[PDB]
Amino acid sequence: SSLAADLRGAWHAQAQSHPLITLGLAASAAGVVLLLVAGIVNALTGENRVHVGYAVLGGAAGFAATALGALMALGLRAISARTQDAMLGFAAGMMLAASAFSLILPGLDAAGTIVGPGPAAAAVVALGLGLGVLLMLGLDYFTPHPEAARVNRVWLFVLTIILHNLPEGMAIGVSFATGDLRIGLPLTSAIAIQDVPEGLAVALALRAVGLPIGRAVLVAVASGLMEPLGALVGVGISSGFALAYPISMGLAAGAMIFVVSHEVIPETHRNGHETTATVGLMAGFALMMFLDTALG
Amino acid sequence: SSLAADLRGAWHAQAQSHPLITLGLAASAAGVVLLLVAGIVNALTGENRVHVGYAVLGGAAGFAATALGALMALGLRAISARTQDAMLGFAAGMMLAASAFSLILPGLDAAGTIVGPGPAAAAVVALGLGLGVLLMLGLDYFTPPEAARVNRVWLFVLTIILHNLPEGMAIGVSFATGDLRIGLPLTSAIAIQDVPEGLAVALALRAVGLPIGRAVLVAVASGLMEPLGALVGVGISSGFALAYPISMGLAAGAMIFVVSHEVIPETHRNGHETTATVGLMAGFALMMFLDTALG
Ligand SMILES: CCCCCCCC/C=C\CCCCCCCCOC(=O)[C@H](O)CO
Ligand SMILES: CCCCCCCC/C=C\CCCCCCCCOC(=O)[C@H](O)CO
Ligand SMILES: CCCCCCCC/C=C\CCCCCCCCOC(=O)[C@H](O)CO
Ligand SMILES: CCCCCCCC/C=C\CCCCCCCCOC(=O)[C@H](O)CO
Ligand SMILES: CCCCCCCC/C=C\CCCCCCCCOC(=O)[C@H](O)CO
Ligand SMILES: CCCCCCCC/C=C\CCCCCCCCOC(=O)[C@H](O)CO
Ligand SMILES: CCCCCCCC/C=C\CCCCCCCCOC(=O)[C@H](O)CO
Ligand SMILES: CCCCCCCC/C=C\CCCCCCCCOC(=O)[C@H](O)CO
């Protein structure tokens, strides 16, 4: 009846019930660890020369944006679901444009120069892109959605609340892996716009579980530490070999498209203000497209 | 009766009872926050071009060493206090030599080229060096019956997670120049330290009342402060030319305070005083030996 046994049993249960999601998670997990090892072994042997500095400031900004919203949960009055859906809807739009125009596109240009700009450029991004979708489909499924029992769920809840921002951080690290501000700033800022609404929501979600407002906020602030930590994971997976960057550019794109469509867009519609949320999605997408078009 | 109010009152209480420890902490905190902003503003305006990469892999090693020791708390049999005193005494010896020979020395050479190798070199490390002692004295002093017993398990786990941030900033400061002869000795010294305290942190949480697995899970997560702290360490070393030698001193003072006032008392508490002391000698001597070999 230890939560370790509870996790192993539930993980056994879902692996039996969803074998392809489970197999697709095993493969993606394997790739991430392999590109990470490769990127560490490359570093240990000299010769790496990645751009960690910009990724570290990028991850830190995200820490602050999460905290910012986390602290909005102590304010007086309230923020209606109506305003949150627009805030979350706008961010989801900038996040869609960013993984299209700041990660999938440059990742083709990346893989273009190594292996050829044809179907060979397209199939290297795809290896990442499908791998990122499968990665976050498995984490969605192998993550949770009566005194001793009720407590362990607060544990299983707080831990996926803490970790869930690691991918958003790894996308940040991958955009900045070449130190290119035109690749990085659009993505990093788009995740920072998203972090404010999710910071508030993460915090209020914890208060709903039963933590007093202050620990609930302190846990919400600690959630943003995964984006500095993830950015470190992102730079290392981009860097074992020449093909690791475009694969990773693809994998971050896949991870971020899955999170928006299958996780955040349902949050906007669940509150019921469907029209205002999707018009934001258009506004977020269009303006992000405009800014990448301007800076080129 | 909220835990926020309980912390605010106790911080008011300790600031009244220890005014110089309190002002000495206000001052040190101030410098670190200032050297960080300065170091970030430097990057945002271009011109920084430091390589965090070396500090990042160093911080990652520390994560693993803490995790390593944390997971030893699931083992069969047990590890005697006698063996733990030797492990911790040896590490404290390597940490003293390292902040002497890998942080204070190079920090003098640093301030040497900037302002001169006389008393001008010595007073720039010292500004930092006293600032590191003052920083870790204040953190020692300002960190710690149903509703009451729980808020201390909260305040306990919270300082348990945070306590490695300074050990992490020392790592970032050794590597702030990407010089492996400064960096490797220091970070390896803390990684040797990280294994024994990882075991202790895990067992200490289990003694508080967390089941063995969450106690181990919290212990593993404590090691994340050394990657994160190392980022803080790179930013304070880098606002201006004098920020590096100050920070070399500031980590040295912070690390000397932790060894002498925190790690050495732990080794004696279990009672095997002699073995801890010759270990500390062995750790110091070999570390000196390796710095002399590496030059
Ligand atoms: C738009 C396309 C939609 C298609 C979605 C399905 C994607 C497939 C998901 C995961 C496949 C992972 C690729 C490696 C498979 C090798 C399985 C080889 O077999 C194995 O390794 C098993 O252990 C066999 O038991
Ligand atoms: C930023 C997030 C990155 C985190 C990466 C780690 C998270 C999840 C870790 C592991 C997933 C393991 C799933 C086990 C499936 C085994 C059945 C099927 O096993 C298999 O079929 C094997 O392929 C054997 O051939
Ligand atoms: C509990 C709180 C823990 C805090 C967690 C977040 C840590 C991040 C905080 C500050 C990061 C500043 C380090 C970057 C300094 C060098 C800029 C890098 O710029 C560069 O040097 C580039 O190479 C330029 O080319
Ligand atoms: C308690 C720990 C500290 C937490 C505080 C977090 C500080 C927030 C840090 C940076 C905000 C802006 C970062 C932008 C990404 C890097 C752009 C770099 O861009 C540039 O280089 C210039 O635009 C031109 O060079
Ligand atoms: C390695 C290269 C891989 C090649 C491409 C494979 C990528 C897989 C692409 C898309 C899979 C995402 C759709 C997820 C379907 C199940 C979610 C649905 O979950 C649900 O919510 C239920 O249906 C109930 O509503
Ligand atoms: C909860 C788990 C989340 C993960 C927590 C973070 C701990 C692991 C952090 C980083 C692992 C990879 C280090 C960076 C690899 C890039 C080498 C650095 O690049 C370089 O080597 C430079 O170019 C010079 O050496
Ligand atoms: C890596 C760990 C670094 C963490 C640093 C942040 C933690 C420090 C937190 C709070 C500082 C304590 C303030 C004490 C007030 C004394 C009033 C006296 O105030 C004053 O009169 C003037 O400010 C003197 O300068
Ligand atoms: C051993 C731990 C290792 C490192 C831990 C670093 C994380 C930081 C841990 C605790 C934070 C201490 C800050 C307390 C501020 C007290 C000022 C309060 O003063 C006041 O509020 C009065 O107004 C003063 O007059």
Author numbering:
A (entry chain B): 5 to 149, 159 to 309
B (entry chain A): 5 to 148, 159 to 309
Copied sentences from the primary study:
The Zrt-/Irt-like protein (ZIP) family consists of ubiquitously expressed divalent metal transporters critically involved in maintaining systemic and cellular homeostasis of zinc, iron, and manganese. The ZIPs import metal ions, including Zn2+, Fe2+, Mn2+, and other divalent metals in the first row of the d-block region in the periodic table, to cytoplasm. Here, we present a study on a prokaryotic ZIP from Bordetella bronchiseptica (BbZIP) by combining structural biology, evolutionary covariance, computational modeling, and a variety of biochemical assays to tackle the issue of the transport mechanism which has not been established for the ZIP family. The findings, in particular the structure of BbZIP in the apo state and a biochemically validated outward-facing conformation model, consistently support the conclusion that BbZIP is an elevator-type transporter where a four-transmembrane helix (TM) bundle with bound metal substrate slides as a rigid body against the dimeric domain composed of the other static TMs to implement the alternating access mechanism.
